Structures are given as structure tokens and as C-alpha cells.
């Protein structure tokens, strides 16, 4: 139980961090364009 | 409940004396508690019931005094247990994101208009979080409106006059304080009075905060200048609706 919950939490946090990082550089690095 | 259950247990276990104690039903105390709970709840399964003459007599004389007691106590006990403050707690100040506090006349239409004008996509990509502070708890429509702005607005029930509620919304880190006014009132002087009170009450807790407010008359706006910390230089505003109209 707890191990699966921790795995799901870590996966969700990693996915959120990756999506935020991808969107951040997609937006700033192309502010002029 | 317990006394009636115990009396039923004693009567059913010890049969009526005139029948030579030949009516022992052999009822456990828990069974009698269950029977009393069922009988005074009007449900009446009938699986467990009193069979002795004294037990039936006590059931008859207890129904009248117990059904009313149950019907008058259980809903009322539930009501007193359910007394709670839904929109309590304080606001957590998030670093790197400024927040503002909006108080005054909070209503479904006014809040919706303010939200659709403040959070329009026309303005730049700015992330300012709005915190509402009103005494009256929002109705279903206002709660539904707040649900559609889940990550952008929060509500905290309280009084702006209370210095504790001002600390609850963390005006120390608040960017600005916004006070709405009930324009369509029967007493503009009274509305300006209450509003001047918030003006003051907010100033007493934190003079450094900036205030954007609506005034229905010009003499009350002039009275606002008499407040010690009416620092309009760095930032302060008082929209006189009559003057601007």
C-alpha cells in the first residue's frame, strides 16, 4: 500500500515538474517570436 | 434509553408475579437496548418484543413519552452537533506570488463582475491571487462561482472589523485592500459610514497597506482625507462614484 502510494506520488510530481520545465523554456526562449 | 432498557430486561426476565413467573422470555440486556431503540424510533421490526403483561403495559405507557422525546431530541442533537464554521482557517502566504484582499459588499453579481474584469485574458500574464473576507457565508451560487476559480480565489468567513480576521488573511503581505460598496442602497450616508469604519479598522491594524475603495458621496471622501494614514503619495485611492458620474 504505502510503497505504491509513494510511487504514484513521485510519478505525479516528476510529471508535473517535467511539464512545467518544458512549458517554461518553450515560452521564455521564444518570447520575441 | 438505558433506564427503559433495564426495566424491560428486568420485567421480561422476571415474569409477572400473578402467573408464577412462568413467562421468562430470556432477553439479554443488549437485546432489550435494541428493542427500545427500535420501538421509540417508530420502525418496529417485531422480531423482538415484550410478551409479559407488565412488559406490554410499560411499552404502552412508554411509547407516548418516548416517541415524542426521540423525535424532539435526535434532530435537535444533530443540529447542535452540526454547528461549525465551514469557511474558517487562515491564508498561507505563498512566496513569489502577491495576493490582495477584497472585502465590503460581497454579492454573487458584484463578485462575478470583479472576477471577470480582474482575471480577463486581455491583461498581461500576471499571477495575483484574490482573497475574499465577508461576514455572511456564501450561498450555493457564490460557492459554485468560487469553484470555477479554484486555483485563483479563496474565501475566509470573518469580520473586517476584527483585528484577528485581518491577521487571518495576512494583510501584512497583502499587496492591496479592496472595499466594494453597495451603490443601490437606501441610505448612502449609512453605507459611507460603515465603509469609513472598515477604512479605519484596516488602517488601525496596518497603516502601510494601500486601499482602493468606492465612495457614494464627496463629503465622505473628504472625510477620508482626515484619516491619519491616508498616504495617497506612494499609493491610495478613493473612487467617488457620484463625482465621477
Amino acid at each position: 500500500g504505502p510503497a505504491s502510494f509513494l510511487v504514484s506520488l513521485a510519478s505525479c510530481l516528476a510529471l508535473g515538474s517535467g511539464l512545467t520545465a518544458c512549458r517554461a523554456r518553450r515560452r521564455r526562449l521564444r518570447t520575441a517570436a | 434509553w438505558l433506564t427503559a432498557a433495564g426495566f424491560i430486561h428486568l420485567v421480561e426476565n422476571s415474569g409477572d408475579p400473578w402467573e408464577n413467573f412462568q413467562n421468562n422470555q430470556a432477553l439479554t440486556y443488549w437485546e432489550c437496548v435494541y428493542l427500545l431503540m427500535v420501538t421509540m424510533s417508530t420502525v418496529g421490526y417485531g422480531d423482538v418484543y415484550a410478551k409479559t403483561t407488565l412488559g406490554r403495559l410499560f411499552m404502552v405507557f412508554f411509547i407516548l413519552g418516548g416517541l415524542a422525546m426521540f423525535a424532539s431530541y435526535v434532530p435537535e442533537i444533530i443540529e447542535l452537533i452540526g454547528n461549525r464554521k465551514k469557511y474558517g482557517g487562515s491564508y498561507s502566504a505563498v512566496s513569489g506570488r502577491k495576493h490582495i484582499v477584497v472585502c465590503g459588499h460581497i454579492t454573487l453579481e458584484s463578485v462575478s463582475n470583479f472576477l471577470k474584469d480582474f482575471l480577463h485574458k486581455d491583461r498581461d500574464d500576471v499571477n495575483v491571487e484574490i482573497v475574499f473576507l465577508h461576514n455572511i457565508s456564501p450561498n450555493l451560487e457564490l460557492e459554485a462561482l468560487f469553484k470555477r476559480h479554484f486555483t485563483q480565489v479563496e474565501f475566509y468567513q470573518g469580520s473586517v472589523l476584527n483585528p484577528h480576521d485581518l491577521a487571518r488573511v495576512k494583510i501584512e503581505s497583502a499587496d492591496a485592500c479592496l472595499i466594494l460598496a453597495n451603490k443601490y442602497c437606501a441610505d448612502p450616508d449609512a453605507e459611507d459610514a460603515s465603509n469609513i469604519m472598515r477604512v479605519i479598522s484596516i488602517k488601525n491594524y496596518h497603516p502601510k497597506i494601500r486601499i482602493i475603495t468606492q465612495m457614494l458621496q464627496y463629503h465622505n471622501k473628504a472625510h477620508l482625507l482626515n484619516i491619519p494614514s491616508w498616504n495617497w503619495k506612494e499609493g491610495d485611492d478613493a473612487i467617488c462614484l457620484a463625482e465621477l458620474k
Binding site: - | 483585528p163 484577528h164 459610514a193 488601525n204 491619519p228
Partner: protein
């Protein structure tokens, strides 16, 4: 109104008078703040106790002075206040356990009576003023009363406010001029009783107007009084003294050729909650009591709620209430009550030698400390020597200390508010910047 007038005569007197009647146990706080010294004065209550057989000897007066060192208590047939020139001693002991140490231990100008001042009746048109003449007329150290009222407003009654300021030992030159600012209709309504009073002025308008306040020389006034009458009409808790506060603030926010924040102003509040709005540089908590609030402790706030404890003190020994009536409002002689009952209008007559003899009353006054022969005691470090010398030199007893709020801190500050101390201990350190309460005699 008597307490308000007493505060006008000497600032902070209303706060200590109210605190002397409420029963408060001694409390201590670890932190060194202005409240720590203030809470040592609120613990002293007003008591009544009989004297001993050691003090019934050669003379009652001469034994009274300088005997407080042994008894460690303060003393204040008939009503006696500062007895100079069986008796019930009006003590200021901190408790009733140690009050049992006195007896136990044995080693046309005046009125019809002369209690107040009277003059010929005046017409409302002869006292109504205007901003042109009000600014032209010079007023310094006078009394300004801001009155809020309407057509349907209730009746306060200002006869009890000007009466305490016109006592017998107040000379016509020393009489403090009183000016009323507010709606003229309310003053006209109250004019039926406010016409036999000398040195009174009325300026129409509203106290919320800066120009009207500028005209009456608000900056140099001795005391500004904010009073309201319409609060009995509105039943909204939020709106109540929503008034009064705005004016107190306009008074504080004015700018003169300096800021008016240090102007001595006292405000009357019907709601105790609104007191937090009186000051901005203070902690505002709804849980704390009114007597702990800084504006009340500084004598700038007063409410009728602190007078509810008067009933309990009055019940246990009734002598206090007449002592209150002779300590405030000038004096309530038995004859004056009958005269007020039968005519309901104060009148006067030609003075008599006995009429002028009814002037030995001693009244409150505020004494500075920067200049005077007593400058040696400004920073002597022992409060007891100060009042001992006051008693043994000029026959004056001091209730306590009127001390600056920030005087307790080593670093200097620009604060002006001063809180009251009642009966400081014998080993109490003094500060050169200080004010002294005293009961000055006549001359």
C-alpha cells in the same frame, strides 16, 4: 461628564478615578513595557476605615501628614479631602487585608451659596460666533467641546460639564474658557439651562470641519472633548461611535504652522470595541479589557461601562458616593441638592463673609517637573521623598505619577502619550520628564 471635566482640569484623572473603584488583583508581567508599571497602579482600590486612638490626640491634621511611611498606605466627622490647616479615613490601599493597619497599629459674582460662579443670563444671539470673529478672538489654554446632534437627537445635558470647571477656588482670571462647536439647533434646545453660565461661546457648524476647528484655536486648547447624542438612535454595532472616531482622527491629522497628534483630546465611546480605532501605534485585541487599552490608560478615552462597578463599592460603605460628588462636579452640598430640586435652575445672590468662607476646598491640578524648587527630586530615584517633601513643605499630597509611555526605554522617542500611575511604591524611580497630580488648596 464630571470625570470628563476632571480630565480637562488635569489629564488622566478620569482613568485613575475609574480604576480606583474597580476591584483588581495584583498582576505581574515578565517583559518590561509600559503596562508593567501601569498594572501596579490599578491594583489600588478606594476603601473606608476608621482611625486609631494614637491619631486622636492633640490634632487630627498634623498627624495625618508624613505618617504614610510607617503605615505604607495613603490617606485622602464630615467629608475630608487633604485635611490641612471618630473620623473615617478614605484610603487608597491595594487590598482590604492590609487596610487594617491604621486603627489596629498603635506603635452676584458667586452663586447662592458660594460653591460655584454665577453671572447675568445671556441670550443665544449674544454668544453665537462665526469663523471671522472666532479666529479674531484670542483663545489659549481654553476648553473646546465638540457636540454631535440632530433635530431628533437625544438630550445629553451640558450643565454637568461646565459646573466642575467653575469651582470656588477657581478665580475669574484662572477660569478656563469653554467653547461649544456643533449644530446650533441642539445648543438652542439645551439653551434653556445653558444661559446663566459665564465665559461660554458657541460656534455653529460641525466638528468634522477643519476650518471651524482652526477658528477656535484648537492647537493651543487645554482639552478637546468629543461627545455624541445620536448614538441612541442607531442600533447598529458597527456604526455606533463610527462617529466620534473620525473627529478624533481629524484632530490628530491636522497640521499647524506642527502636527496635532499631540493635542490633548478625550473621546467618549458608547461601544468599548471601537477604542482600538483611537490609536494606531498600539496592539488591538478584542480579548483584552478596556482598562488595559492604551488610549484609556492615557486618559484620552472614557466609557460609561467602567462606572458599573460603582454600585458594588457604594453598597459596602455609602460614604464613597458623596466623596465622589465632592471630588468631581465641584461639590454637592446638601443645600444645593434642595435648591436644584425646587427651582431646577441655578441662581445666585450677594456674597456674605460666610459665603466667601466656603472656599477652603482643595481641587485637583497638574504640576510639571522640569522647572521648580523641587527639581532636585526630578531624578532622585525615590518617589517617596517627593511626596514626603510635598507634604512637609507646601502641604500637598500626590495621587501618583503621570508617566510617558516610552520613558521606560533607554533610547529617546517622539511619543507624547502619558499613562497614569496611582500610589507608586516608596522605592519608585523617577524621571525628569513627568507630571504630578495634586490637590491644590485655595489662596
Amino acid at each position: 461628564l464630571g470625570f470628563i471635566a476632571q480630565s480637562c482640569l488635569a489629564q488622566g484623572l478620569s482613568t485613575m478615578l475609574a480604576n480606583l473603584f474597580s476591584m483588581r488583583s495584583f498582576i505581574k508581567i515578565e517583559e518590561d513595557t509600559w503596562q508593567k508599571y501601569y498594572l501596579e497602579g490599578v491594583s489600588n482600590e478606594m476603601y473606608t476605615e476608621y482611625l486609631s486612638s494614637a491619631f486622636v490626640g492633640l490634632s487630627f491634621p498634623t498627624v495625618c501628614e508624613l505618617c504614610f511611611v510607617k503605615l505604607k498606605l495613603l490617606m485622602i466627622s464630615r467629608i475630608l479631602i487633604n485635611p490641612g490647616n471618630g473620623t473615617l479615613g478614605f484610603f487608597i490601599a491595594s487590598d482590604a487585608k492590609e487596610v487594617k493597619r491604621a486603627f489596629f497599629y498603635c506603635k452676584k459674582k458667586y452663586d447662592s451659596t458660594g460653591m460655584f460662579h454665577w453671572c447675568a443670563p445671556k441670550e443665544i444671539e449674544k454668544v453665537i460666533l462665526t469663523r471671522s470673529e472666532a479666529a479674531m478672538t484670542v483663545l489659549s489654554g481654553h476648553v473646546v467641546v465638540c457636540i454631535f446632534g440632530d433635530v431628533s437627537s437625544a438630550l445629553i445635558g451640558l450643565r454637568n460639564l461646565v459646573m466642575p470647571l467653575r469651582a470656588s477656588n477657581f478665580h475669574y482670571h484662572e477660569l478656563k474658557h469653554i467653547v461649544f462647536v456643533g449644530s446650533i439647533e441642539y445648543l438652542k434646545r439645551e439653551w434653556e439651562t445653558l444661559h446663566n453660565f459665564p465665559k461660554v461661546s458657541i460656534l455653529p457648524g460641525t466638528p468634522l470641519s477643519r476650518a471651524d476647528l482652526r477658528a477656535v484655536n484648537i492647537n493651543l486648547c487645554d482639552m478637546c472633548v468629543i461627545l455624541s447624542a445620536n448614538q441612541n438612535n442607531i442600533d447598529d454595532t458597527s456604526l455606533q461611535d463610527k462617529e466620534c472616531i473620525l473627529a478624533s482622527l481629524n484632530i490628530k491629522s491636522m497640521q499647524f504652522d506642527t502636527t496635532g497628534v499631540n493635542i490633548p483630546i478625550i473621546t467618549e465611546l458608547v461601544n468599548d470595541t471601537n477604542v482600538q480605532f483611537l490609536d494606531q501605534d498600539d496592539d488591538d485585541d478584542p480579548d483584552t479589557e478596556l482598562y488595559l487599552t492604551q488610549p484609556f490608560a492615557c486618559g484620552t478615552a472614557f466609557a460609561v461601562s467602567v462606572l458599573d462597578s460603582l454600585m458594588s463599592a457604594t453598597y459596602f460603605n455609602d460614604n464613597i458616593l458623596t466623596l465622589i460628588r465632592t471630588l468631581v462636579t465641584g461639590g454637592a452640598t446638601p443645600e444645593l441638592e434642595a435648591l436644584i430640586a425646587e427651582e431646577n435652575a441655578l441662581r445666585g445672590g450677594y456674597s456674605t463673609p460666610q459665603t466667601l468662607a466656603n472656599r477652603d476646598r482643595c481641587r485637583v491640578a497638574q504640576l510639571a517637573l522640569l522647572d521648580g524648587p523641587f527639581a532636585d527630586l526630578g531624578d532622585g530615584g525615590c518617589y517617596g521623598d517627593l511626596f514626603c517633601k510635598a507634604l512637609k513643605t507646601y502641604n500637598m499630597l500626590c495621587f501618583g505619577i503621570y508617566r510617558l509611555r516610552d520613558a521606560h526605554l533607554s533610547t529617546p522617542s517622539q511619543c507624547t502619550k502619558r499613562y497614569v500611575i496611582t500610589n507608586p511604591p516608596y522605592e519608585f524611580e523617577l524621571v525628569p520628564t513627568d507630571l504630578i497630580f495634586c490637590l491644590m488648596q485655595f489662596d
